[PDB]
Symmetry: D2
Subunit: 398 residues, 4 copies
């Protein structure tokens, strides 16, 4: 049915939402508001801007029109009411959590977390008297059992950093609705093109827009999407007062540029990673593979229900442990050795020998990290070139 | 008589410090390192990059060569050991204090702060079990009388926002050294061209680079300068984990561009501001007037000790109260009605009918804010046009 | 057939060719050389760079590393020896022809041309002693018969901008071997992803990089690719001395950003256009459709033979004439009315009522422009939304 | 004095002219229209737009709102009717001359020209039938005798890129008026802040905005200022059709940023320059010195008549010829060895061993280039550091 109130499709909105060129001298690309302050015609229009009474701007840290279009567009893409743009992923996560939690509050966390998130919680906010508990968010019994009435927030990534462990977002939402908690999901890996946690009951979605959304590895940015009520608070307290993590209008404009090919890029990320994952499963050097699009995936059924495509990230374990991981990493000639993900260029990392090298093997097992675990951000290059590079590096891995 | 590569002068260093073109293909202006991530030649090289050895970049949130140049240069200008660059002034202050303070520690503050510093403190970090206390930082006895063994940090501005109130920085530092407290000075209004708190005994300096250091009103940014020990902590804890206020390499490059004219612009700001404050002082409509370069200024002796020039900001209180504020502000044709300062274009605000418009006269009294107070950021325009515009707007304020 | 002598795939080279992060501090994305000028370690290493005896820059109007990477990359994608980046499409075209022609030389031109190319030739260089001859370049017998000993250059677009008329590039190149002319093809419409004239025997290719190569409509740029000797000549005469059409490094970086999704965007442009064009052919009001992908296209077999895909451009003819054209255009809610093409946003133009409405109905006819001629640049939106917009607007056409 | 048609001073206009923040949501700094194309609300609005009725925009190569701001501001600064922004100084020169010259026309030229301008004239437009004669533009008898009916343009720099030879601009205009000829002056060295050739009777002014206007060595740009009717033709023929030398809106915004400190930088460039000149003029290693601000300067009087300050450029000749100049350049440690000028960083060049190194001693003396001629672009650094560096390089010049 063609409809009068039917949403334009994802691609259309990623390109167009929230912008009419007619409102801006006909400019097809929005002009970039690289400006710190705005001006007032009088002080009555000025006082009304500080009140949230008129929808005109005063200062770029609080709100900016280039930033607003990005936020509006991202909110559309996630299906949410409102968006906030910030200087990084961590800036999104810290501004949100700082806003929502106070001493005595408890936050329930996914069992594994992105390292700096884990750092923010245990060495940052968790040292200012906020309580932390990890649970397996795929274990709805154990989550139910962990809830107190001090439980203010449930925060997780899905899929999660190390082995791609999923959580059942709607089943988690159900339990949060019962006890009255706020569910915050890091949707970095899937993006709104593949997973929309707000449509599954989550209250807030955070993103490292540094990754897939930008797509080209040339900005650092974060996004928060949720209801107006919550995002308004994160804007006026978390951002304004508590992190100062303001995104550049230059970078916001690059971000929107990237978002315009998001669907296209993700289709290719996913098509390439599928092929690569299936390659890796059949290789003698490989003990174990975690990829949502392989049938062997433990949470395969949950992956097809809550994500429309299995994603661009692969984690696998080399048989020969840390030495094998090192040699594999040092052999790659197309894949680059780097932290980060979601660029056009394929990336790889081996926490045992990189990010987490100055731990012991036993302390790595504590954080879900195998000695042979290698993570791949499969990029947009030709798959035959990527297979040739991976095959050659597997040989060198012995 | 000191010569042979002596310490180069302030202008020279503002243009050249930390950069020889021969190390980047002869490029006179350093290339902008607008990249999120960096690559390693081996995994072992990368083990060293997170561990602190063979340092040379993994991820722009922690560090980036464009930012490193800015940081080093601002360190040279302030005479500190190390710099840090962030997404905003608030980014600098929050990252600093989040790092230095924990529940049970106390911090002492100047009587009046920048609005959001004040809001961070009372409604942010204060609500996380950190004790706050306001002293007059010109009164060395009163400061001594507030010290406790839990006092970890002394934070203030000088001059400070409303009335241009100075602190005896050398005096505060002596006390702080006895007590093991860290002194953090917000040096935004002066910049290192006019005042260098580290040479007077402060430990850390912070800036809204949004203002004078950028000078052109097109970026939001902050800086921190101080000891390697303190800055390494602020970088690796406050910024990496607690704020995520990452500065865009693009804007960091505009900031370096602004710094290149800093002496020249500050000379002009100060020359324009002098003429205007002498003018305003001879005016029937103008009650009191707060400019450090008037002989009448209460702390004239302290200000000439700490500041090489009297600044670019004027505060004056008007006889007609709020009504005369509104008429004066709405009458300006050259000065712009906006918050912010240190821009090429002259700015004017009047908190009674704008920033603090719905606070009613009493809560305003408890912050230093007179009902007729008008703040001027004097800009770079021709002094005669600026005179004419103030002239004309006093007439209409009756 | 493994082995390192294999050419990497087009998408790999669009992302990586000519750049190794290791040579620039690990920066995954190359730093932007936003610098006018370059420096020398000695006056002797200076004397080498002006002569071309040493690899090194001196001045970004002649040469700059950000541009040089863009150039090397475009050369690889077209399969030429060398490239040159310029401030616009017309910068590439004029820099080329100013370099190659002198009074007395003849240039054979394709029968229709881009309006501004046409204007340059007849009202510009043509008025300076260079003779012009139009010829049907799809008619090899006629082209042979037009050659004369004064013929220096054969220049054309394929497909050609208005009606998608095409020329046999291998056929033209072979006539040009025989007589001695230099063949230059404007390959804007296809990009190197779809058509590679150098590989079919052309000497030089030019682009409006403003269109598809950029893909996102935020920049104005041009590219020449050809033999080292011809491009060097165009660099050092046409660009340096005769146009000054220097590309901003910033923009060159955006163009490299756009090229990273070129194959992905072209695939989607083309799929969307195939679907739209089939629809347009089945519809009452359409007199005559022209799309290379439909069998009714007069040079169907030639298109199939020189282009890997039929492209993103459609021209059709409404039955109601000039009036039905204005009516359809004004009815568009998603397609935007504007000149240009190869954006993510779909564009529509109607010369009789827009670009060529200054003219009379019979002067439009001299240039091959029907009265109901509508041109569509099909973008990357969801095809269903674009179908609906064009369905909706065909109704409004009676 | 005060009259209602009052003109704001140079610095005010450089910062404000042609922009009201109220016309763009209050944005203190103008938004950057980084867009290639522009949209129409109806087909008819666009029709009356290409035609020139209605003040809207269609394509950024023709015209762009950011560029038009820069163009109005530069027009104001030079006291001319209309402005044009281009990709480089050469862009402006060529776009100008290709508009006004045709085969058989004569252009009369100052005796010496910037090498690239000379190259354009002799090896470019001059090889298309345009006649060239060089004449001394200070000798008015010689110029009157040089005039012919073919003489359509008189083009020169003043001061001129040799030896700072000046032209009698008002004298020249009086002779050109007698014969209908168009006088175009390259005012790069002075900028409008120091010389306003249009006020002395010139028709058109050209600028490499790459130099002092930008001030910071980070862009390549050109400006033309003159009468509405000439500029229009240069835009709609030279720019649009004959060079395609389109300025990036981003670089245009950086150039506006630079112009905001033009007075202030030029004041310092000249004060540093006056100091090095008075020093250099007393050194035994130094034969001759060409600086307008020395009393011994042959054209002292004319210089002071056209120019409010003597400029930031110095040329001198070392007694020891080619080897002296080589040893001097090589010894420099603050001054950079580079071509270009008008940067905040001080630059120096020695044509005999650099630009014109490949040439012979007799061919250099033919263009007025001594074997020992050194040219300094005096920068904004501390004059004491600059003195020490020139000093030390003078001692090594033995
Ligand atoms: C990178 C990342 C972050 C951190 O974001 P930044 O933009 O790097 O600060 C958070 N979560 C996930 C899942 C990430 O990958
Ligand atoms: C503006 C300002 C700040 C805040 O910095 P932002 O860059 O606006 O975050 C802090 N201190 C002073 C004195 C300021 O003026
Ligand atoms: C647009 C176009 C040009 C001109 O390029 P600009 O970037 O607009 O200067 C040349 N040829 C074709 C086929 C074009 O479409
Ligand atoms: C540099 C220069 C030019 C040329 O300008 P570009 O921006 O380099 O093209 C023209 N005239 C003078 C006097 C110059 O110095």
């Amino acid at each position: 049915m063609h409809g009068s109130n039917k949403l334009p499709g994802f691609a259309t909105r990623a390109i167009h939402h929230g912008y009419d060129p007619q409102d801006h001298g006909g400019a097809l690309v929005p002009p970039v508001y690289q400006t710190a302050t705005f001006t007032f015609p009088t002080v009555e229009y000025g006082a009304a801007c500080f009140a949230g009474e008129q929808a005109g701007h005063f200062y770029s840290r609080i709100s900016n029109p280039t930033l607003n279009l990005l936020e509006a567009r991202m909110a559309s893409l996630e299906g949410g009411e409102a968006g906030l743009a910030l200087a990084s992923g961590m800036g999104a996560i810290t501004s949100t959590l700082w806003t929502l939690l106070r001493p005595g509050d408890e936050v329930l966390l996914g069992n594994t977390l992105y390292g700096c998130t884990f750092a923010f919680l245990h060495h940052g906010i968790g040292e200012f008297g906020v309580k932390l508990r990890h649970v397996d968010m795929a274990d709805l019994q154990a989550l139910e059992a962990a809830m107190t009435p001090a439980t203010r927030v449930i925060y997780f990534e899905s899929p999660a950093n190390p082995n791609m462990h999923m959580a059942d977002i709607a089943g988690v939402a159900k339990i949060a609705r019962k006890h009255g908690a706020t569910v915050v999901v890091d949707n970095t890996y899937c993006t709104p093109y593949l997973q929309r946690p707000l449509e599954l009951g989550a209250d807030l979605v955070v993103h490292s827009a540094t990754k897939y959304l930008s797509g080209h590895g040339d900005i650092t940015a974060g996004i928060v999407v949720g209801s107006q009520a919550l995002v308004d608070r994160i804007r006026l307290q978390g951002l304004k007062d508590m992190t100062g993590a303001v995104l550049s209008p230059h970078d916001a404009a690059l971000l929107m540029r990237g978002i315009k090919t998001l669907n296209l890029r993700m289709d290719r990320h996913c098509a390439n990673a599928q092929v690569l994952a299936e390659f890796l499963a059949r290789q003698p050097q490989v003990e174990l593979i975690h990829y949502p699009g392989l049938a062997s995936f433990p949470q395969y059924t949950l992956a097809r229900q809550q994500m429309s495509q299995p994603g661009g990230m692969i984690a696998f374990e080399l048989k020969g442990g840390i030495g094998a991981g090192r040699r594999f990493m040092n052999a790659l000639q197309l894949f680059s050795r780097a932290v980060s993900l979601g660029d056009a260029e394929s990336l790889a990392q081996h926490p045992a020998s990189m990010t987490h090298s100055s731990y012991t093997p036993e302390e790595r097992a504590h954080y879900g990290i195998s000695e042979g675990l290698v993570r791949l951000s499969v990029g947009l290059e030709d798959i035959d070139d990527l297979l040739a590079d991976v095959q050659q590096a597997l040989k060198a891995s012995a």
